[PDB]
Structure 1
């Protein structure tokens, strides 16, 4: 019902009052809280005196910590080569605007851009490639012959696959990051457009380089150094010069420049633990105006009034990009460090750029004469997110109602970057780390001084609950400084901690694996479950007969002789639950692979898949709670189902089913006398059969050959610089607290008085160092069958915030490169 925005200057508050008066959003009132600087506004938000504010990307990492503890919530979205049905989304967003006479993208039947796009109110038309970009030169006014529009929707990867080394592309048609030559056995990594990145080519037999995912994006902004053409100094002569900066905490004003100076060996400084950055910089420049700085000489050139001088605020006239430009123009500085948004051609007469290659270039080449790419700013609120909903509602309704958000007659870049086109809500999961990405986050961390000092003799294990934490603390007490503990909420959070340099290793089930391997983490060791062969564990290296991995299988009655694999469409199927690998994942994957219509809600009839829609066919014959008429619990992902799990899905094949999808063990777990005492009394393991791929059958004890696929074992993961460490520290720790370890009376790695299946599954036999075969990482852990069947042998089969954070954003002028 009310949203308080924090303004850092008088001009920002004037724009805020303007928007209070003009922008009428129903049921949400706007309020302007005035503070004197950026930091004061952050504090006011932390104190609940205000609700949200805009921040530069560089100010984000320090905002997520004490004494602010803020999180990003609303950012500007970038166009990329990963967007799907972009025309439909853009058309919807345009139709949602409360205005008339604006361009509403025209879509065809299939959700693709019409090659010709017209602006209705003006009569202008133009041509457009698949991603909506205007083909240069095709804008035609009314009354003039329209440019004939071709259909530019063939991607470059598919255009290269034809006329043919044959690359591998994904379902949409982009480049797979890992490329493998079929003629000459080799492996390398490629760009977002197919360019081979140097230093990655690998002859066969050798392990291949770990390739990283690339997204091609447009409209990137950069940090630049600007100098008047009359001056004659270069980059490595900055020492002693007078500088103008946008702000002490901005990326375009401070942080990128510092990273460059350090890499260029120009800044006399070693580490942030013994001397702050501002000291070294104050000794580097003579006099400067760097808003927010605490060194006297770094504020001499500023022109703010008494008390307003050198603040992170427009009250300081030299604050911001345009403030630094004004500082350079009035000759209060020799070089201005700012963003490529303040660039204009009206300035290309007097001003030029100053490249880190000790050369000068005109403004228009800012793409090749810069200090780094600068991500867009973000709206931030309290990490507790008590007001995210209201802020998002107000901002998006103001965008629909065409309020003057990203412009003002009072000044430039007030409240928001004036270069902002549209603001969109981020996932609630996104914090500073997920927003900045792994690389940029680690860079911010190393710059602020929180860089962790790696220990090659201590592994920090991550726990997912308090019971795991208690077992970890027992292990750490009996460990002798080799095992430490960290706390997280879910395995995904542990992977985040590992990538943030706050933890070292963690055991992941296969379901969490695809993301982990996608972010550069490798398997150090794996969980052995073969209850019958302790050979490979007592002498580390003795060959492995079988790993004890689960085998997903389809189990049927010998009574129903007609059910074969090539006719499973329509039969009552049985699933352990929506999410389980053997009970749900493998079958639906193989189905959408072999039957191209790929509809599983209609493929089966009256299946029991606990976890699907209560009204669909996937929740019939699901007897929910036999003796509980006080609650309807049918089709639930809990034991309140009489069909959840291996046992519950086995009840289905004997009751009202024709086929079940379970691990192979279930048949031997509830038959042949070793069964509970209700429904599987006189049932034997001979009365059942398995379904194989070629459409035949076999006895149950053929799960090695008549199998759907193989389930990869749970794996302990860590970073590549810790493998050789973690492995050995595991080995040392396994000869002491394993099953046949020396001090098994002190502690067991595979049992606990605090709970069951903590840290590792209780039926685990031992841990084995993951051998790194010379092939793809996913193909090595998952195995070619599982990989190809579930993920389609692709690195684009999944999209989450974490993979988006492990992504290199390849900047380009446009996606027209096809």
Structure 2
């Protein structure tokens, strides 16, 4: 009902009151809370006095910590080569605007961009490629011969796949990060456009380099040092000069400059624990104006009045990008560190850029002469996110109603960056780490001083609940300083902690492994489930045969001698539940591969897959709690469904179905005497058979040959630098607390009184070292069958916030490179 915005200056407050008066959003009211600086507004948000503000990307990490504890919620989205159906999305977005006579993108039937676009209000038309980018020079006014627009829709990857070294592309025509030559057998990592990255080409037999996924984005902004052409100094002579900065906490005015000076060895500075950054900067520069600084000489050149001087606010006339430009223009400084947004063509006559390679270049060369890319700022609110919905509603409705959010006659960059075109909602999972990305997050963490000192003799194991925390505390109190414990809410959180330098290793099931292998983590050891062959456990060197791996199989009755694999379409099937690997992932993936129609909801007849739509075909013949007529628990994801799990899928197969998709272990578990005594009382394993991929059938005990696919074992993952330590520490702890260790009388790693299946599955025998084979790490862990079947041998089969945080953003002028 009410959204309070925190303004850091009087100009921001004037713009805020203007927006309060003019912008009318129904059911939401804008309130302007005035503070004197950015830190004061962050504190007011932390105290509940305000609801949201805009922060530079260099202020997000320090905002996610005490004494602020804020999180980004809304940010400006970038255009990339991963945008799917951009035309439909942008057309809906334009139609949702309360305005007449604006450009609504025209799309065809399939949802692609029409090669010719037209602004119906003005009559202008132009040509456009697959991503909606205007072909240069094709803008024609009304009454003039139009430019004949052809079809620029073929990605470079498939164009190089023709006329033929044959590269691998994903299902959307983008370059796969890893490239494998067929004739010579080499492996190398490539750019977002297919350019080979240096230092990655590895001959065969050698383990290939871990390739990182790349995305190509447009409209990038940079941090630049701007000088007057009348000056004569270079970059390595900045010491003793007078500088102007946009702000002490901004990337484009501080962080990037400090990083460059530390790299180029210009800044005599020990470290964050030994000396403050501001003190080294005060010793480096002469008099300067750096808003927010706490050293006197760093505020000497500022022009604010008493009480307003050197404050992180527009009350200081030298604050921000344009503030630093004004500080340089009035000869209060010799160089100005700001963003590429403040650059204009009216300045190229008097001003130029100061490149870190000790040369000077014009302004229009900022893409080749900068201190680094600067991500966009964010709207931040409290980490508890009590007002995120109202803030998002107000901002989206203000964008729909064309309110003057990103411009003002009072000044530049008030409230938001004036370069901002559109604000979109970020996923609630996004924090400072998931927003900045792994590399930038760790850079900010090292700059602030929170860089963890790695220990080569202690492993920080991550837990996912309190029972695992208690088991880990036992293991740590008995480990003798070799094991410590961190707490997370889910295995995804454990992977995030490992990527943040806060944890060291964690056991992941196969479903969590893809992302883990996509972010650079490697498997250190693997669980060994073979309850028979001991030897690869007691004397490390005995070659392992069967890892106890579960084999996904399609079980049918020997009564029904018509169900083959080449006709499964239409029959009633049984699944263990939506999400299970052998009970859903393998069969659905295989079906979507084989039959190109790709519609599982209509593929089968009345299958029972617990967790699907109650009204769809995938939730029939599911007897949900027969005794409980006081609730409808049909097709439930829990034990309240009689056909849930392996036992439930076998029940469905025995009672009403024709085929079931289960691991091979269910049959022997629910037949041959060892079975329960309610339904499986006189059932024999010879009364069933397995469907094979060749349309044939086999006895149940042939699960190693007549299998849908194999399931990889759960893998303990860690960073690459910690593999050598984690593996041997696991071996040392296993020689003491394993199934056949020295001191099992104190702690067993594979069982606990605190609970079952904590840290490791109780049925596990031991933890074998992962032998990294010289091929794709994805294909090495998953195995080529699982890789190709489920993820299509591609690194684009899935997408999430973590993978986006682990992707490199390859800046570009446009996506026109195709």
The normalised TM-score by structure 1 is 1.00
Distance 1:366 1:356 in 2: 12
Distance 1:120 1:559 in 2: 67
- Per-residue CA shift, 1:546-586, capped at 9, x if unaligned? 10000000000000000000000000000000000000000
- Per-residue CA shift, 1:685-721, capped at 9, x if unaligned? 0000000000000100000000000000000000000
Q: Residue 288 of structure 1 aligns with which residue?
A: 288
Shift in Å, 1:473: 0.1
Shift in Å, 1:213: 0.3
Distance 1:626 1:473 in 2: 43
Pairs within 5 Å for 1:163-562: 163-562=163-562
Shift in Å, 1:244: 0.1
- Per-residue CA shift, 1:737-792, capped at 9, x if unaligned? 00111100100000000000000000000000000000000100000000000000
- Per-residue CA shift, 1:245-289, capped at 9, x if unaligned? 000000000000000000000000121101000000000001000
Q: Which runs of 5+ in 1 are unaligned?
A: none
Question: What is the SS of the residue equivalent to 2:536?
Answer: helix
Shift in Å, 1:352: 0.2
- Per-residue CA shift, 1:43-78, capped at 9, x if unaligned? 000000000000000000000000000000000000
Distance 2:316 2:362 in 1: 29
Distance 1:56 1:654 in 2: 62
Question: What is the SS of the residue equivalent to 2:216?
Answer: strand
Distance 1:643 1:737 in 2: 38
- Per-residue CA shift, 1:772-818, capped at 9, x if unaligned? 00000010000000000000000000000000000100000000000
Shift in Å, 1:653: 1.0
Shift in Å, 1:103: 0.1
- Per-residue CA shift, 1:445-485, capped at 9, x if unaligned? 00000000000000000000000000000000000000000
- Per-residue CA shift, 1:384-410, capped at 9, x if unaligned? 000000000000000000000000000
Question: What is the SS of the residue equivalent to 2:553?
Answer: strand
Q: Say whether 1:3 aligns with 2:6.
A: no
Shift in Å, 1:597: 0.4
Question: What is the SS of the residue equivalent to 1:816?
Answer: helix
Shift in Å, 1:541: 1.4
Shift in Å, 1:192: 0.2
After superposition, the CA RMSD in angstroms is: 0.3
Shift in Å, 1:8: 0.2
Q: Which runs of 5+ in 2 are unaligned?
A: none
Question: What is the SS of the residue equivalent to 1:327?
Answer: helix
Shift in Å, 1:88: 0.1
- Per-residue CA shift, 1:100-123, capped at 9, x if unaligned? 000000000000000000000000
Distance 2:338 2:120 in 1: 39
Q: Residue 32 of structure 1 aligns with which residue?
A: 32
Distance 2:662 2:612 in 1: 17
Shift in Å, 1:436: 0.0
Shift in Å, 1:733: 0.1
Shift in Å, 1:620: 0.1
Distance 2:734 2:764 in 1: 12
Q: Deviating runs (4+, > 4 A) in structure 1?
A: none
- Per-residue CA shift, 1:647-687, capped at 9, x if unaligned? 00000111000000000000000000001110011100000
Distance 1:614 1:575 in 2: 15
- Per-residue CA shift, 1:363-389, capped at 9, x if unaligned? 000000000000000000000000000
Distance 2:564 2:587 in 1: 14
- Per-residue CA shift, 1:291-315, capped at 9, x if unaligned? 0000000000000000000000000
Shift in Å, 1:545: 1.8
Distance 2:563 2:605 in 1: 14
Shift in Å, 1:626: 1.4
Q: Residue 728 of structure 1 aligns with which residue?
A: 728
Distance 1:669 1:246 in 2: 69
Distance 1:658 1:77 in 2: 49
Distance 1:274 1:367 in 2: 35
Distance 1:696 1:535 in 2: 36
Distance 2:797 2:511 in 1: 14
Question: What is the SS of the residue equivalent to 2:280?
Answer: helix
- Per-residue CA shift, 1:465-506, capped at 9, x if unaligned? 000000000000000000000000000000000000000000
Distance 2:771 2:58 in 1: 40
Q: Residue 745 of structure 1 aligns with which residue?
A: 745
Question: What is the SS of the residue equivalent to 2:537?
Answer: helix
Question: What is the SS of the residue equivalent to 1:767?
Answer: strand
* Number of equivalent positions: 818
Question: What is the SS of the residue equivalent to 2:633?
Answer: coil
- Per-residue CA shift, 1:327-383, capped at 9, x if unaligned? 000000000000000000000000000000000000000000000000000000000
Distance 1:339 1:276 in 2: 25
Distance 1:531 1:807 in 2: 40
Shift in Å, 1:4: 0.1
Q: Residue 692 of structure 1 aligns with which residue?
A: 692
Q: Say whether 1:593 aligns with 2:588.
A: no
Distance 1:572 1:310 in 2: 73
The normalised TM-score by structure 2 is 1.00
- Per-residue CA shift, 1:617-664, capped at 9, x if unaligned? 000000000100000000000000000100000001110000000000
